[PDB]
Amino acid sequence: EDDDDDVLLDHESKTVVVDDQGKPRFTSASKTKIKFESRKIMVPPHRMTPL
Amino acid sequence: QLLKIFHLKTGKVVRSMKISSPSYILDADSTSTLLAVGGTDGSIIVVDIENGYITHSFKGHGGTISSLKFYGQLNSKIWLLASGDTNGMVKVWDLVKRKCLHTLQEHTSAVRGLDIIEVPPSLNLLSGGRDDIINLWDFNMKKKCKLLKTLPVNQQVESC
Amino acid sequence: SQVFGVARIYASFNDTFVHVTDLSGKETIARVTGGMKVKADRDESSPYAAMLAAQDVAAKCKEVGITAVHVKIRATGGTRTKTPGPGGQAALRALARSGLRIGRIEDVTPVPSDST
Amino acid sequence: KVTGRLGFESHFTKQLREGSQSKDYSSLLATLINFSPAAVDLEIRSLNSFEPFDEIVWFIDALTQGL
Amino acid sequence: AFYVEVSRSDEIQKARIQLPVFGEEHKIMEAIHHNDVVIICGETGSGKTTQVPQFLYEAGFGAEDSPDYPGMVGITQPRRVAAVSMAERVANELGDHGHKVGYQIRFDSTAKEDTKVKFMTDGVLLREMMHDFKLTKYSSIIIDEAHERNINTDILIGMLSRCVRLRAKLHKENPIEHKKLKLIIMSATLRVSDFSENKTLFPIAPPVLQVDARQFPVSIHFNRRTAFNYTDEAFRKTCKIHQKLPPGAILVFLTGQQEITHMVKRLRKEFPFKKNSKYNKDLETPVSKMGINSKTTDLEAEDIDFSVQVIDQDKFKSAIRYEEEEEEGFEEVLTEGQTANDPLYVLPLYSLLPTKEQMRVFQKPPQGSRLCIVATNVAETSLTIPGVRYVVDSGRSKERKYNESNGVQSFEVGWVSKASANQRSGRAGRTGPGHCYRLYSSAVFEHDFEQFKPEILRMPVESIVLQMKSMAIHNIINFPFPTPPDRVALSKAIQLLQYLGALDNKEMITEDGKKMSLFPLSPRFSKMLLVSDEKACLPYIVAIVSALSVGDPFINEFELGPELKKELRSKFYKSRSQFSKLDKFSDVFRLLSVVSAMDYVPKEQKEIFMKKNFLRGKLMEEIVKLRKQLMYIIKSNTSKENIAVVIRNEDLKSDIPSVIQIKLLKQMICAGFVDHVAVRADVLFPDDAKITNRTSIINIPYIPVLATRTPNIEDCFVYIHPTSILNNLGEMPPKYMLYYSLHLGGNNKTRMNTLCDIASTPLANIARKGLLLTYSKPLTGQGLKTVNLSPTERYCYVVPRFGSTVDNDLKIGWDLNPIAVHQKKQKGQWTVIKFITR
Ligand SMILES: Nc1ncnc2c1ncn2[C@@H]1O[C@H](COP(=O)(O)OP(=O)(O)O)[C@@H](O)[C@H]1O
């Protein structure tokens, strides 16, 4: 009477095989980030100590 | 946002992909089942249209990408891609080995309108441009050379 | 390798302008306003109006080929408010979101040295 | 949490199947009168009503032999 | 109304007069006019594959003017290469009418417009008949070379008998609202009584006719020895033929695409052309090589691997040991003008060719060059080569072979029958007095070549009835086959498909059932390889199914088991407890880990592991041969790119699973063999079990599902096999075990083929898809309550019952542990969607 616990749920190539009617068919493609931007904003030196 | 509509009675959106750059040139093959699309950075994805997803990436290039063309005869083993450019160049890819065949830097504006055929692998190609030069090449499979230039006075778009 | 346009975002009163130019200043690309998107004549200085205006400029400039934008905010200048309104930040937020690399935010609003 | 020895079925439906195979329902009705009304509703709301209708025509014939 | 005028060309006209199929055309067309189901018992080399549909177009089939037969004409070649070749053939034959000929080889191809006498493929018109159960369109249906007894031909005529029965029934009262249906069957042998005179297939007796031809003398030559490498034997023989023998073309009956392309490039190397045109033609023939057409087409016998066979030289000679310089066929003189190094117009012909190589057989060679075909069974009855004189036969054709309850299941190249072998040999004396060279001895040809079998006998009935369900026919228990199989066995097949999830309780196939039916393999293994694309367990599962399909690798008790025997058994048990054993003690992880150990070894270190850890060489090599091919098959069918997948090396090789992946593969093999489960008898009969630790481990009784429990004691009480990790350690066996099959020992103890152990919950999760388990009512006596969301939803808490103990007619079954379900109330009953994790 010991019950287990299991879910049990739910690179590339260099060749071709075409078809019986012409129509070539290639293998899968490899997998495919935003930016590197920056913004500088000056601080007037009367709101310095609050910062 | 790339989409494809099967033109038959099932007019539903069959496949829908998220491509990288907003693209402005597409070409399908002379046969079916090959769709090439290149963005406005250097990336020319090609897609088998039946079970629609990416079959080649082709980072490869530079600048925004002008017109391009397939080389398709049914039941072949060649399957090249043409790949024009804005800064004037033509960088031919195949599709059976994912390699840059020949790098060609010779033009001066956007390489619109290029075409590939064979005459007895000979495979002569021809690449126009916004400059007035149509500039056909011999384009062997291993190592290529040049022939005549023959200079039309236009601004050639899709020199078929 | 990126290439650069220049925004020249005009945060006027009762209107907003966005038109990217190549960084000389001559060859302007896609002049839009705040008026030619909304249809009310009351909020042609709307932040939303400037937002979709900057979206359309971003689409047209990515179509031409420029990828980064040196951005320059100009208020109406003169003996007037001398300082950007809300439409300037609205267009700035819009074309900073819309896939376009941003460079060198400035302020090119004219200063009078006590004119009339 | 789990609880062992809850083997297949409760005594109402067990006695109903046994009474239907035994052609009388007297012990079933003697249980059904006896046990509590909250439990009576809790079993009679789930009488397995689907396409052969075994359990529900057994219940109707049980009330026939009852009254 | 009567006929439309036809026309043909002069040379094909006189060729039709010269071939003897023109003699019986009027008697055949009158038998067609007087009866629908007409049998023709012709042969290859006659002409009946080609000119009889032209006779039907002459008779008025396809003529719109006739109100009796205004419909289509369908010619059903079972091979798509035969379909396109006879399509272009009759397009040449009808000539000015020749645009009325069409082909349809796959399902995605629809009807072309310009034809009314159209060729097609067997599976193509079965899917056509499936979505058109009435078959309004086709006025006639031609089943040629039906003598092969394919599964497609069997299902084909089994549907077509009831089809022509109902169509004639609806027609004979009213020709306007219902047209005729003329069924025309052909064959190569004359044993067509299983098609015509079977009362289950036909209560109404249909008329039988013949129209055979003539043949020149075939000189058959059997060799004094029989060579191992039949490719090198046939190649050496055919170079001696093209060197020395008088002119006449060659047909080489060999096996597969790989061997045939190797022989074609070797023949072009031996007899080359200087001319660029013929050299580039041979280059195109060698370049255009393969095609598969996996799902969206019909299938044939070129799956190219599902075969666990193995071989050697002593094995071959011990198979043919009854067989206990100047060679036959080396008699005639080389003719003048025929050099020994003449150019050879070499042509491959396998079923996986493109059309632009399938048309190149019928072109005349360059002058001074002799024609040559290297092929397989397409040119046996369907196709014939106009010009051959020498045929040379290896005597081995790839078909289905499967023997039961022992884990032998191979799509291997066996040994061809005597009748089909003589039908292959009869293509020698066909253009003149010819020469057949059978690449063996006549003692071999006597012994191991049987005389006259169907694919429906060679293939499992579960895959057969799954094929029928994917073709969507439901009255299968009384369906008219020529060989109707065991009704007990096919009812067990329907029960098995309901257990696996292919068939619902109203007997319509599911999507998982169709994805099982796509496979050229067993339904259990197809279920395994469909389900195990989850959480990176596919190399492990393909290793397990490859091991079970290849057989036992362990050299365990075919040998010892006084001064060296003790040490050798001790080191054998040490090799068991070594890297064969590291993970658990269930059973089958050793069978995984010995094949995972084939990655931890360089190629020049090959023999030491088998010769140390007691493994068989050819079986251990053919499992690592089969693993790549089986992973290719299932990746090709289930991955999003059908044909273009390739198999790299390390992903077929290995990795190492820790805990989640071993329990996940445990529920995968449970999904494989969900009806071969077993229980320790304490949980059904604790008095009869006598559960003690000193009972031997091959004596603690196990009980299977669905088996009768009579008051005799050892009815269900089947025991563990000695060749597991229990009977070797045996501390306490877990309660629910699995087995592959059962083998009765000499002490009347049915020993097992035990696999693994599940506690309760993955067994329940696997069974949920199947129709094994019947649920209880929601049980909330002392536990926590059922929560509803709606009158059709439920979050209740139920115990499941596995072996259907409701109305227990001795089919033994056991309860499980309570589990929380999520129901949906379909049509009065509460089906289950999922479970709820803790
Ligand atoms: N596609 C084709 N092109 C030219 N000739 C063919 C073709 N197919 C078959 N033949 C020839 O037609 C003749 C008649 O054979 P066929 O009608 O095909 O088979 P069967 O003899 O079984 O009726 C054969 O000698 C064969 O060589």
CATH of the domain at C48: 3.30.420.80
| Distance from the alpha carbon of residue E41 to the mean position of ligand 1, in angstroms | 17
Q: What is the DSSP letter of E509?
A: B
User: In a 10 Å sphere around its CB, with 0-12 CB exposed, 13-18 middle and 19+ buried, how is residue E524 labelled?
Assistant: buried
Rounded CA separation E216/E218 (Å): 6
Rounded CA separation C93/C95 (Å): 6
In 3D, which of B80, B150, B153, B64 has the Cα closest to residue B115? B80
| Mutation probe of ligand 1 site: the residue of E49, E54, E214 with most atoms within 8 A of C-beta | E49
Looking at the partner chain, which of E105, E291, E761 has a beta carbon nearest the beta carbon of A4? Answer: E761
Strand B13-17 relative to strand B2-5, pairing: antiparallel
Rounded CA separation B19/E594 (Å): 45
Rounded CA separation E729/E349 (Å): 57
CB contact under 8 A, E643 and A13: no
Residue B45 identity: I
How many other C-beta atoms are found inside a 10 Å radius of the C-beta of residue E92?
15
User: Closest chain B residue to A28 measured between Cα atoms?
Assistant: B55
How many other C-beta atoms are found inside a 10 Å radius of the C-beta of residue D33?
9
Say whether E629 sits in a helix, a strand or coil: helix
Answer whether D51's CB lies under 8 Å from E828's CB. Answer: yes
Helices assigned H by DSSP within E371-471: 418-425, 442-447, 455-458, 461-470
Q: Treating both helix axes as pointing N-terminal to C-terminal, what angle do E523-531 and E538-550 enclose, rounded to 10 degrees?
A: 160
Helix, strand, coil distribution of chain A in percent, nearest 5: 0, 0, 100
Looking at the partner chain, which of A1, A6, A27 has a beta carbon nearest the beta carbon of E664? Answer: A6
How many other C-beta atoms are found inside a 10 Å radius of the C-beta of residue E806?
12
User: In a mutagenesis test of the B interface, which of E640, E643, E645, E646 is the best target, namely the one with the most B β-carbons within 10 Å?
Assistant: E640
Strand partners, B93: B81, B100
Interface of A with B (CB under 8 A): 12, 14-16, 18-19, 21-30, 32
Answer whether E349's CB lies under 8 Å from E378's CB. Answer: yes
| Distance from the alpha carbon of residue E591 to the mean position of ligand 1, in angstroms | 52
**Token digits for E576?**
């068991």
Q: How was this structure determined?
A: cryo-EM
CB contact under 8 A, B75 and E640: no
Q: Nearest 5°: phi and psi at E398? A: -75, 115
Distance from C55 to chain B by nearest Cα, in Å?
13
Length of chain D: 67
CB contact under 8 A, A29 and B54: yes
Rounded CA separation E179/E60 (Å): 14
* E760 close to A (CB below 8 A): yes
Apex E762 CA angle, E761 and E765, nearest 5: 90
In 3D, which of E135, E95, E85 has the Cα closest to residue E11? E95
Q: Report DSSP letters for E96-145, one per residue.
A: TSGGGEE---SSSS---TT-SEEEEEHHHHHHHHHH-SS--SEEEEEETT
E385 Cα nearest atom in ligand 1: 27
Strand partners, B81: B70, B93
Residue burial E704-720, b: 16+ Cβ < 10 Å; e: rest: bbbeebeeeeeebbbbb
Say whether E429 sits in a helix, a strand or coil: coil
Q: Count Cα neighbours of E427 within 13 Å in the Cβ-side half-sphere.
A: 30
In 3D, which of E453, E464, E481 has the Cα closest to residue E520? E464
Q: What is the DSSP letter of E321?
A: G
User: Closest chain E residue to A13 measured between Cα atoms?
Assistant: E646
Answer whether D12's CB lies under 8 Å from D32's CB. Answer: yes
Strand E38-40 relative to strand B114-116, pairing: unpaired
Rounded CA separation B3/B14 (Å): 8
Give resolution, Å, one decimal: 4.0
| Distance from the alpha carbon of residue E362 to the mean position of ligand 1, in angstroms | 10
Looking at the partner chain, which of E354, E641, E642 has a beta carbon nearest the beta carbon of B75? Answer: E354
The residue assigned the tokens 């009808």 is: E94
C-alpha dihedral, A17 to A18 to A19 to A20, nearest 10°:
-100
Which partners does chain C have (≥3 C-beta pairs < 8 Å)?
Answer: A, B
User: Closest chain C residue to A41 measured between Cα atoms?
Assistant: C105
**Token digits for E569?**
């058994």
Beta strands in E386-492 (DSSP E): 388-393, 401-403, 408-410, 434-438
The residue assigned the tokens 């009512």 is: E777
Structural domain tally of chain C? 1
Which partners does chain E have (≥3 C-beta pairs < 8 Å)?
Answer: A, B, D
Q: What is the DSSP letter of E833?
A: E
* A1 close to C (CB below 8 A): no
**Residues near ligand 1 (Cβ within 6 A):** E 44-50, 85, 88-89, 362, 381, 383-386
**Token digits for E103?**
């082909």
Rounded CA separation E287/E277 (Å): 15
Q: Which domain holds residue C29?
A: 1-116
Beta strands in E576-673 (DSSP E): none
Answer whether E434's CB lies under 8 Å from E390's CB. Answer: yes
Rounded CA separation E283/E250 (Å): 20
Apex E561 CA angle, E558 and E566, nearest 5: 135
Rounded CA separation E266/E260 (Å): 10
Rounded CA separation E746/E822 (Å): 49
Q: What's the per-residue H, E or C state across E20-63?
A: HHHCCHHHHHHHHHHCCCEEECCCCCCCHHHHHHHHHHHHCCCC
CB contact under 8 A, E817 and D7: no
- Binding site members of E: 42-49
- Chain A and chain C share a number of CB contacts under 8 A equal to 4
In 3D, which of E772, E732, E737 has the Cα closest to residue E755? E737
CB contact under 8 A, C59 and B86: no
The sign of the CA dihedral B98, B99, B105, B106 is negative
Q: Which residues contact E491 (CB under 8 A, 6 or more apart)?
A: E477
CB contact under 8 A, E80 and A8: no
User: Closest chain A residue to C104 measured between Cα atoms?
Assistant: A39
Residue burial E476-507, b: 16+ Cβ < 10 Å; e: rest: beebbbbebbeeeebebbbebbbbbbbbeeee
* B67 close to C (CB below 8 A): no
E505 vs E497, E509, E514, E516, E834, CA distance in Å?
10, 10, 16, 18, 19
Rounded CA separation E185/E192 (Å): 10
Say whether E589 sits in a helix, a strand or coil: helix
- Binding site members of E for ATP: 42-49
User: Closest chain A residue to C68 measured between Cα atoms?
Assistant: A37
**Token digits for E471?**
């073709």
Residue E205 identity: A
A16 vs A12, B85, E90, E353, E400, CA distance in Å?
12, 28, 34, 15, 29
Rounded CA separation E489/E495 (Å): 10
Apex E94 CA angle, E89 and E99, nearest 5: 85
Residue B151 identity: L
Strand partners, D53: none
